[PDB]
Design a protein around this ligand. Structure first.
Ligand code: MG
Ligand code: SM
Ligand code: SM
Ligand code: SM
Lengths: 146, 146
């Protein structure tokens, strides 16, 4: 089955931000790497923990399994790697349920790939800002179409 | 049999670089994926060939057969999966002959595992820079000791 590429990982890290020192996120959840909140080598993330970029990649691939599974489950048409990598980035952000209900998905499964790419741009709001995710969506759309 | 793990493949792809569109290496050899120069789907690698990340990983797993075979034929002591994955990365780089004559091998076969790990750091020179591979060797050593 398909898998995220090295370029896909690099681009996703850029979009998400990578933090090699543990921190408490805006909700209070200990986090490290690229959004990793689960255990790291058998222990909970905690103040003072540091990891390498390569460990951060390892953890991110573990945390992307639900994303890759969702694409495998939901998408029934061919994807090139750039399309796949872009979708990984979108889905990692908006979540599986949002993607399952999305125009991106519906258009993809009709093989309207340009329309699916354009539908990335709908996923632009966060909180009280109607367009804060639009620059990310544009970069993902560009990758999808590349 | 022991074989490279998915973690081992990810880490090796990081060290080597992945190209999903065919290119000519610095010597002029058509290459794709992670150092693949043989045919892909029955055709010679050539300008215009594209592949997926899944393909790239499956090609790499097959291209590593000489590495896996070198470990089986030369290493006389047990290896855990992290050790194995780190060895694959070193050997894929320096080649079978270099590994056969190495301090890494000698120390490994004496069951001097820490000294074997440390001896990775000897394989640091390339061209006119005496340490340019040292960061890679340190990362592989860290994987070995993990
Ligand atoms: Mg063999
Ligand atoms: Sm396959
Ligand atoms: Sm899985
Ligand atoms: Sm705004």
């Amino acid at each position: 089955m398909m898998q995220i590429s090295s370029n896909g990982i690099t681009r996703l890290k850029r979009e998400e931000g990578e933090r090699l020192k543990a921190y408490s996120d805006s909700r209070g959840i200990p986090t490290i790497g690229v959004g990793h909140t689960g255990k790291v080598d058998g222990n909970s993330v905690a103040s003072g923990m540091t990891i390498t970029a390569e460990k951060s990649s390892e953890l991110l691939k573990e945390d992307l399994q639900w994303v890759e599974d969702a694409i495998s489950s939901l998408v029934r048409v061919p994807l090139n790697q750039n399309q796949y990598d872009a979708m990984c980035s979108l889905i990692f952000n908006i979540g599986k349920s949002a993607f399952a209900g999305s125009t991106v998905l519906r258009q993809l499964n009709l093989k309207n790939y340009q329309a699916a790419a354009d539908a990335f741009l709908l996923w632009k709001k966060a909180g009280k800002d109607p367009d804060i995710l639009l620059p990310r969506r544009r970069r993902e759309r560009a990758l999808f179409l590349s």
